[PDB]
Amino acid sequence: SIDKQQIAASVPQRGFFGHPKGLFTLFFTEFWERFSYYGMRAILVYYMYYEVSKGGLGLDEHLALAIMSIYGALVYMSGIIGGWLADRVFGTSRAVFYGGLLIMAGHIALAIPGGVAALFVSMALIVLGTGLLKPNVSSIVGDMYKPGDDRRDAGFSIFYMGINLGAFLAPLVVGTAGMKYNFHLGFGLAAVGMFLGLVVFVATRKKNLGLAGTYVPNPLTPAEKKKAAAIMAVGAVVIAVLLAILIPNGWFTVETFISLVGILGIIIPIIYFVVMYRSPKTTAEERSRVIAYIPLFVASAMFWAIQQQGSTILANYADKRTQLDVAGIHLSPAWFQSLNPLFIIILAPVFAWMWVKLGKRQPTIPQKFALGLLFAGLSFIVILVPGHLSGGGLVHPIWLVLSYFIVVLGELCLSPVGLSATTKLAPAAFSAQTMSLWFLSNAAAQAINAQLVRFYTPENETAYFGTIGGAALVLGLILLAIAPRIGRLMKG
Numbered sequence: 363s364i365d366k367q368q369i370a371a372s373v374p375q376r377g378f379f380g381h382p383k384g385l386f387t388l389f390f391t392e393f394w395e396r397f398s399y400y401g402m403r404a405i406l407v408y409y410m411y412y413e414v415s416k417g418g419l420g421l422d423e424h425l426a427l428a429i430m431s432i433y434g435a436l437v438y439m440s441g442i443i444g445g446w447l448a449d450r451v452f453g454t455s456r457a458v459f460y461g462g463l464l465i466m467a468g469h470i471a472l473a474i475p476g477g478v479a480a481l482f483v484s485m486a487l488i489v490l491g492t493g494l495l496k497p498n499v500s501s502i503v504g505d506m507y508k509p510g511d512d513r514r515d516a517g518f519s520i521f522y523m524g525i526n527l528g529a530f531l532a533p534l535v536v537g538t539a540g541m542k543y544n545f546h547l548g549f550g551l552a553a554v555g556m557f558l559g560l561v562v563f564v565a566t567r568k569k570n571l572g573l574a575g576t577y578v579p580n581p582l583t584p585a586e587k588k589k590a591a592a593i594m595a596v597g598a599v600v601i602a603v604l605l606a607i608l609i610p611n612g613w614f615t616v617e618t619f620i621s622l623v624g625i626l627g628i629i630i631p632i633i634y635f636v637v638m639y640r641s642p643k644t645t646a647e648e649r650s651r652v653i654a655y656i657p658l659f660v661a662s663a664m665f666w667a668i669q670q671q672g673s674t675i676l677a678n679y680a681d682k683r684t685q686l687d688v689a690g691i692h693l694s695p696a697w698f699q700s701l702n703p704l705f706i707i708i709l710a711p712v713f714a715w716m717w718v719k720l721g722k723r724q725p726t727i728p729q730k731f732a733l734g735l736l737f738a739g740l741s742f743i744v745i746l747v748p749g750h751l752s753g754g755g756l757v758h759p760i761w762l763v764l765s766y767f768i769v770v771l772g773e774l775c776l777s778p779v780g781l782s783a784t785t786k787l788a789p790a791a792f793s794a795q796t797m798s799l800w801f802l803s804n805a806a807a808q809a810i811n812a813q814l815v816r817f818y819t820p821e822n823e824t825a826y827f828g829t830i831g832g833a834a835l836v837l838g839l840i841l842l843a844i845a846p847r848i849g850r851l852m853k854g
Contacts, residue, residue: 364577370508372572381517382506384570387562389524392499394559395462396528398469398552399492401536404696406430407677409472409545410481417545419478423678424815425616430674431812432623433485438805440493442798445501447494448575450582454498454505455567455575461494462560469553473546497797498575505574529703537696620812627809631659631802643791654851655787659803661731661841664834665776666807667814668738669769672702674811675818676745676762683749683823685756693759701766706773713774727779727786727852728845734776735838741768742831746824786853 377383410426412418421429448457468487471480503521507514536555540548582590608614638644638652680686680695687693717724725733745765748757784800785793792799818826 363579364573366505367508369505369573373506373574374570374572375506377570379520381513381520382570384506384567384572384574385503385517385520387566387570388499388503389521391458391462391559391563392496392521393524393528394555394562395465395492395495395499396525397532397536398465398555398559399488399532400529400699401532401540401555402469402472402488402549402552403430403433403673404533404537404677404699405540405545405548406433407674408541408681408695409549412545419481421478424818427674427678427818428620428812428815429485429616430677431670431808431815432620433489434670434673435623435627435805435808435812436485436489437492438801438808440489441497441801442493444490444493444495445497445797448498448501449578450580451578452494453575453578454501455571457494457498458502458563458575459560461491461496461498462556462563464488464491465495466553466556466560467491469549469556472549473553475546502571502575506571523707526703526707530700530707533694533696533699537694537699541694541696623809624813627806631806634799634802635659638789638792641789641791644789648789651787651851651853652789654848655784657841657844658728658731658783658787658848659799661735661837662776662780662800662803663807663810664837665731665734665738665772666804667811668742668830668834669773670804670808671811672766672769673699675815676765678818679745680759680762683757683820684759684762686759688759698762698766701763702770702773705767705770709770709774713778725775726845726849727783728848729842730775730779731783732838732841732845734772735834735841737768737772737775739831739834739838741765741772742827742834744768746827746831750824783852787851 373382373384375382378386407426407430408418410419410421410429411423412420414420444457444461448454452460464487468484468491471484471487474480500518500521503517504514507517532552532555536548536551539551605614612618635652635656639649644652677695677699680698684695684698686695742765745761748761781797781800785796788796788799814826814830
């Protein structure tokens with residue numbers, strides 16, 4: 363580990379609107395990575411189930427939606443693996459570079475002509491790449507600011523703005539090109555986008571970032587290196603023999619893989635909670651807090667289940683259930699993916715002002731978890747209405763827009779206090795696993811979403827939206843009732 367002051371001494375402190383010029387490097391690196399990921403994601407589901415004559419892969423709609431959900435789950439889990447790799451072996455800067463290369467390679471696999479096999483390879487590359495780049499790029503920006511610098515909070519705020527900006531612009535650019543012209547063109551623009559991010563990072567990181575991220579904070583001992591390497595070596599071999607027998611006659615299929623991730627989505631959080639609660643490095647007070655964190659984890663998972671279905675289920679809804687031909691123009695179904703980031707950009711300052719204005723009268727963190735859950739459930743109730751009232755046929759796009767608007771209201775309640783809630787209720791011995799634990803509920807939600815896809819049909823569409831939305835409302839009411847007890851248990 364290199365001293366923070368010596369790190370800051372290597373980084374230029376000016377050059378980018380009162381901020382270090384390294385922020386420029388990191389803002390645009392992450393922007394383009396998010397742009398590419400969100401652009402590709404906006405059209406990926408359509409590319410999967412559209413007929414082959416339309417340039418699609420011709421897969422079943424349910425299979426496509428399930429794969430999308432597994433995709434997001436694996437990406438979230440990959441950030442945990444990748445965060446460990448930078449911290450213990452690569453360094454954050456080197457992780458961003460290698461990750462970025464893998465991401466770019468993944469987009470290329472989609473850009474070039476190919477079938478379902480090309481998609482699976484692309485998925486693996488992006489999952490691995492995003493895991494290395496996404497969590498580690500945000501680690502470097504902190505390195506640029508010396509302790510006591512009041513520009514730090516402002517720097518992160520600007521950096522995070524690029525994530526939303528990439529999320530807003532991508533479906534309008536990559537989505538339009540992919541849907542209107544050709545799918546591979548859109549995937550190609552995503553590849554170009556990531557390439558732009560790679561260029562800016564590689565070319566400018568030496569001067570702009572200096573020593574930041576070029577070191578290994580927690581390197582393995584020599585004995586650990588041999589211990590680690592053998593496990594993956596044995597691990598890699600063991601997986602290979604299994605799949606070789608399983609692929610033709612097992613039979614390990616994409617459905618089995620989807621089921622596995624669904625199994626992992628339930629098992630993994632359980633193991634995490636058991637380990638924390640049974641840990642000999644925990645106090646009695648901390649063990650009670652872990653228990654108190656359980657309903658908060660469940661609420662998060664329920665909320666993110668609905669929210670992340672906006673990129674899957676509602677994506678299919680925009681394409682199959684929504685009147686695109688309005689006002690003499692044809693709306694692109696991928697454009698609806700721009701709704702969530704747009705509403706976030708506009709409403710987030712309003713919510714912040716509201717919390718400030720409320721002051722002591724503002725809801726507590728567990729109550730904000732409940733509010734988020736109530737809004738999420740409401741968004742599904744609203745969404746079923748038009749299809750329910752109409753005998754059949756497409757519905758007005760205003761219903762879907764409203765549904766996205768409502769879930770954002772819930773997101774701005776739960777999400778900003780999500781990590782904060784996790785830190786306050788996690789034992790000091792597990793203080794390092796705080797981000798992973800918070801990410802885990804979002805990952806588990808998406809893994810579960812994939813199992814729920816089969817229930818989403820035109821026949822029981824009302825039942826699907828109603829049961830899920832109803833479940834969120836019920837849990838929301840329960841959480842409100844136990845919120846006072848949980849709030850008092852929080853550290854502070």
